[PDB]
Amino acid sequence: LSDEQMQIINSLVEAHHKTYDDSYSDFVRFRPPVRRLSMLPHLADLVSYSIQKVIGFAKMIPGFRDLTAEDQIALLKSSAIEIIMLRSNQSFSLEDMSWSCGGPDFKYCINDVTKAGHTLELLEPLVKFQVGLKKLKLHEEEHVLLMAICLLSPDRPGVQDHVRIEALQDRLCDVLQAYIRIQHPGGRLLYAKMIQKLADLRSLNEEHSKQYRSLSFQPEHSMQLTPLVLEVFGSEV
Amino acid sequence: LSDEQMQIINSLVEAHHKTYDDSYSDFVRFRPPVRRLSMLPHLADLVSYSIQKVIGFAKMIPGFRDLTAEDQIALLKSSAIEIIMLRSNQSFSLEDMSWSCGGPDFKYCINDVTKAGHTLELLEPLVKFQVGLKKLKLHEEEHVLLMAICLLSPDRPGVQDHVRIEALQDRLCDVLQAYIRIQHPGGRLLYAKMIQKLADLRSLNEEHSKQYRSLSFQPEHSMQLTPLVLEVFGSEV
Amino acid sequence: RHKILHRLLQ
Amino acid sequence: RHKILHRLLQ
Ligand SMILES: CCCc1cc(C(O)(CC)CC)ccc1-c1cc(CCc2ccc(CO)c(CO)c2)ccc1C
Ligand SMILES: CCCc1cc(C(O)(CC)CC)ccc1-c1cc(CCc2ccc(CO)c(CO)c2)ccc1C
Numbered sequence: 067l068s069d070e071q072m073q074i075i076n077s078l079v080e081a082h083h084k085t086y087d088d089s090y091s092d093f094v095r096f097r098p099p100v101r102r103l104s105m106l107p108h109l110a111d112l113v114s115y116s117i118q119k120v121i122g123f124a125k126m127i128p129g130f131r132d133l134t135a136e137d138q139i140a141l142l143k144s145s146a147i148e149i150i151m152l153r154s155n156q157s158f159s160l161e162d163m164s165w166s167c168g169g170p171d172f173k174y175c176i177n178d179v180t181k182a183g184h185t186l187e188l189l190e191p192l193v194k195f196q197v198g199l200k201k202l203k204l205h206e207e208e209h210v211l212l213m214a215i216c217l218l219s220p221d222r223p224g225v226q227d228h229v230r231i232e233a234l235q236d237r238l239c240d241v242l243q244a245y246i247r248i249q250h251p252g253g254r255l256l257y258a259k260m261i262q263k264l265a266d267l268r269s270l271n272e273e274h275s276k277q278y279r280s281l282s283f284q285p286e287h288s289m290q291l292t293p294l295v296l297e298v299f300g301s302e303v
Numbered sequence: 304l305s306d307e308q309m310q311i312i313n314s315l316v317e318a319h320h321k322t323y324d325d326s327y328s329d330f331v332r333f334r335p336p337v338r339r340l341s342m343l344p345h346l347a348d349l350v351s352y353s354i355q356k357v358i359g360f361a362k363m364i365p366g367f368r369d370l371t372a373e374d375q376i377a378l379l380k381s382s383a384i385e386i387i388m389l390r391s392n393q394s395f396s397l398e399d400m401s402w403s404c405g406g407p408d409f410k411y412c413i414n415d416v417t418k419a420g421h422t423l424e425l426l427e428p429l430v431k432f433q434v435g436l437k438k439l440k441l442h443e444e445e446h447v448l449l450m451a452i453c454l455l456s457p458d459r460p461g462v463q464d465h466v467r468i469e470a471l472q473d474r475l476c477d478v479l480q481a482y483i484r485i486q487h488p489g490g491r492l493l494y495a496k497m498i499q500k501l502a503d504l505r506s507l508n509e510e511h512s513k514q515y516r517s518l519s520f521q522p523e524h525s526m527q528l529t530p531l532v533l534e535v536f537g538s539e540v
Numbered sequence: 541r542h543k544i545l546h547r548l549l550q
Numbered sequence: 551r552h553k554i555l556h557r558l559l560q
Contacts, residue, residue: 138559291530
């Protein structure tokens, strides 16, 4: 790796730490969990909260801040769900096949999540994704990169400068490819695995989108969402 | 009173009971209270919740259901804050000059409320209103009427059939005037007092409106509100 | 507009 | 539109 490459790693890693609370102390302020879509209020707040973190992370990816305010929104609106599926993995436990966040109230089985309006059609591959990914036992360096790589994809509906964003993503893909080669022993086939994950996040992105429209369309359900969720997941161009 | 008159009283009273939980058990599901607008999340949920109750109450006021869907929204969007200031009084305590709702976490001094984005310009007369009203020691029959009278005012911006709504409100004002004459000893001057209150709710309505625009305009504050609050307090016609 | 108020008013 | 995303992106 070179200095410029490394600087990007230290940059992404610090951005992640600044936007990811390992104490999950902020969950106590979401509308309480309830075990008729009883888990929607809590999860809609968990997700709304997460989006705020993804935006905070994105603003620190080197170069992103220099994109057009419109490109920033375009990349964000379309890759937000994917970044949240990626960052959530840092709390997914293969043991109890759930997301453990500080305490028991903040531990969500495939059961809890069902009461949020989502079906197995999403929950099924979602967990599968979490397991396969959890198994790659990536480093924080690689973990944070994969997020920046996914967020800086030029193949998103809305992207104007789909050529510069093409550069950035590449400048990142290298740092990752390189690191995995130098700093990750036994990871001689990792890169290919990771990139394969960014492709699975596409089918998941799609699924959530349809399932989201279904719920979103019902006001007795959308009135449960947050102004930020509605806007980022809304289709207003 | 006549039978028709009484039937309206039993109708309003049952509607109130069905839309007002004396246990305040639903407050445990709002985003937790915090004592930088720390009380906004909790109060925005308290208010969003209240609006849902006012709509539920309104749908049961005899005749209201027969108004035009547009008239219903017009009356609701403009008199919602007033109905919430009226129904809140059922929990206002002259002792600790606060709103006691089941427990200590759900007890809001003039202090707590300040951290919700509102200034004394509103909080001052608001409490004054609560005291003066709390002192009239109205009956539940009169209390529920005053709410229906206020909600069915034809002098609201948006009202199309401002003549029929003129009838209904009158049909209610009588039942009240009559009851106070027959069923309320010592209340030979009450009616005038109550009606005077509906006039104070107008200056308060105005104040909250301006203060609401101020907050509403800031996305770092409006993203804290609920989809229902934004819509009912929003100025979209 | 008023999408939520309708659902609740029926 | 995107009122909230802007405020957060500055
Ligand atoms: C990717 C699916 C995100 C999602 C969206 C929705 C809505 O679509 C319902 C309307 C929007 C609020 C409801 C529930 C969920 C949903 C949420 C989770 C939570 C994962 C949870 C979320 C985020 C984070 C960090 O940002 C952690 C800890 O790392 C744990 C697991 C599974 C599902 C299906
Ligand atoms: C009438 C003022 C209503 C209001 C609006 C707002 C917002 O404008 C902030 C953006 C909307 C969420 C914030 C805070 C408040 C506000 C809320 C209260 C709560 C009264 C509380 C509210 C409702 C009810 C029953 O429906 C009870 C129990 O009877 C107690 C007391 C004082 C104020 C100033």
